[PDB]
Amino acid sequence: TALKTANSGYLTRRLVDVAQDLVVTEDDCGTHEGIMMTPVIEGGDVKEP
Amino acid sequence: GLPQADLIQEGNIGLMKAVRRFNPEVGVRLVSFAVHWIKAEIHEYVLRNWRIVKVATTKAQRKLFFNLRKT
Amino acid sequence: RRERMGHIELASPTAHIWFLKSLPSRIGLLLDMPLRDIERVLYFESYVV
Amino acid sequence: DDNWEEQAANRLTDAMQGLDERSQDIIRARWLDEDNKSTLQELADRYGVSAERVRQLEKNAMKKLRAAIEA
DNA sequence: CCACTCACTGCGGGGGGTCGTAAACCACGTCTTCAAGGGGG
DNA sequence: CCCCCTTGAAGACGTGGTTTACGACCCCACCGCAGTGAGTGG
């Protein structure tokens, strides 16, 4: 517990620095593509609906 | 606590001064004549660089600088 | 006194350590010379034509 | 400190207005002027008064100045 | 021949003797305004 | 209680003559990571 906090903070800092400059700038874009969303099942158990 | 290289070069300048003012007809070796010039250059460098500010400037202060260490 | 800079006139040219020792070396890459030879020449250990 | 010194100066200006015209120029020339500091004798010839008369006039004028300021 | 390491490096958590100048003055002095008092309840 | 003196001196500001004093110069016979580099052998 005493030692994991520094690693957590370092990872958070790296994520913030890499992702800091992304901002929603447009209402809509003319794309039509996307991704396929399906439930995930592992070992016969529906993990997420 | 001063760098050894800086002290050596200060003495080298003093050695050149003694060489320029050497009289061969006296008969003494240059080693004994130049010992006063070399140690004079080293002493002046220590006074100006021992601290960030010069510690001894006047005549009386310079005498006490090298004597209070032993006294 | 927070804004005024001075300057020092150098008796002989000196190399900037950032453009020498920060890998990759800019001086070495520009001259197409090994860094060790440049270091030897700079610190008065050998000659260069 | 700037606020405190500014409100005290305005009291001096208001007090000086209550003084008579001759006394105002006596205080202003000797005490308020920066380029020149008018002495007792110089103000004497300009208004045809005695050297002591200029000196004696300031005491009464300053009492009026203090009275207005203290009130 | 260019393949395929591996050791290497760097990145994060000591004397005396003269001289010139901005200090460093004690006398220097005459100036100011210190003024004793002068009269109009 | 306005006015011009008096009349004796207290300090006021230099001041560079006079005089110290500072400062300087002269001689002295862990942690895992990744990019680098030779360094082969072929």
From Swiss-Prot, chain C:
Post-translational modification: Acetylated on several lysine residues in the presence of glucose.
Signal peptide from the UniProt entry: none
Name of the protein: DNA-directed RNA polymerase subunit beta'
Record family assignment: Belongs to the RNA polymerase beta' chain family.
Function: DNA-dependent RNA polymerase (RNAP) catalyzes the transcription of DNA into RNA using the four ribonucleoside triphosphates as substrates. Resistance to the antibiotics salinamide A, salinamide B, rifampicin, streptolydigin, CBR703, myxopyronin, and lipiarmycin can result from mutations in this protein.
The gene coding this protein: rpoC
Use in biotech settings: Co-administration of salinamide and rifampicin or salinamide and myxopyronin suppresses the emergence of resistance to both antibiotics.
Superkingdom in the source lineage: Bacteria
Oligomer and partners: The RNAP catalytic core consists of 2 alpha, 1 beta, 1 beta' and 1 omega subunit. When a sigma factor is associated with the core the holoenzyme is formed, which can initiate transcription. The rRNA transcription and antitermination complex (rrnTAC) consists of RNAP, NusA, NusB, NusE (rpsJ), NusG, SubB, ribosomal protein S4, DNA and precursor rRNA; S4 is more flexible than other subunits.
UniProtKB/Swiss-Prot annotation, chain D:
Entry keyword annotation includes Magnesium: no
Keywords: Cytoplasm, DNA-binding, Sigma factor, Stress response, Transcription, Transcription regulation
Induction note: Subject to complex regulation at multiple levels (transcription, translation, regulation of activity and degradation). In the absence of heat shock, or after heat shock, activity is inhibited by transient association with DnaK and DnaJ, which reduces the amounts of free active RpoH, makes it unstable and mediates its degradation by the FtsH protease. During heat shock, the intracellular concentration of RpoH increases, due to slightly increased transcription, increased synthesis and stabilization of the protein.
Keyword DNA-binding: yes
Signal peptide: none
GO biological process, one term: DNA-templated transcription
Subcellular location: Cytoplasm
Entry's Gene Ontology cellular component terms: cytosol; cytosolic DNA-directed RNA polymerase complex; invertasome; plasma membrane
GO terms for MF: bacterial-type RNA polymerase core enzyme binding; core promoter sequence-specific DNA binding; DNA binding; DNA-binding transcription activator activity; sigma factor activity; site-specific recombinase activity
Region (Sigma-70 factor domain-4): 15-67
Effect of inactivating the gene: Mutants exhibit an increased sensitivity to heat shock but only in the exponential phase of aerobic growth.
DNA-binding region: 40-59
Swiss-Prot/TrEMBL domain comment: The sigma-70 factor domain-2 mediates sequence-specific interaction with the -10 element in promoter DNA, and plays an important role in melting the double-stranded DNA and the formation of the transcription bubble. The sigma-70 factor domain-2 mediates interaction with the RNA polymerase subunits RpoB and RpoC. The sigma-70 factor domain-4 contains a helix-turn-helix (H-T-H) motif that mediates interaction with the -35 element in promoter DNA. The domain also mediates interaction with the RNA polymerase subunit RpoA.
Extra remark: May only be involved in heat shocks that occur during exponential phase of growth under aerobic conditions. Different mechanisms may play a prime role during stationary phase and anaerobic growth.
Quaternary structure and partners: Interacts with the RNA polymerase core enzyme. Interacts with DnaK and DnaJ.
Entry's family note: Belongs to the sigma-70 factor family. RpoH subfamily.
Protein role: Sigma factors are initiation factors that promote the attachment of RNA polymerase to specific initiation sites and are then released. This sigma factor is involved in regulation of expression of heat shock genes. Intracellular concentration of free RpoH protein increases in response to heat shock, which causes association with RNA polymerase (RNAP) and initiation of transcription of heat shock genes, including numerous global transcriptional regulators and genes involved in maintaining membrane functionality and homeostasis.
Name this polypeptide is given: RNA polymerase sigma factor RpoH
Gene: rpoH
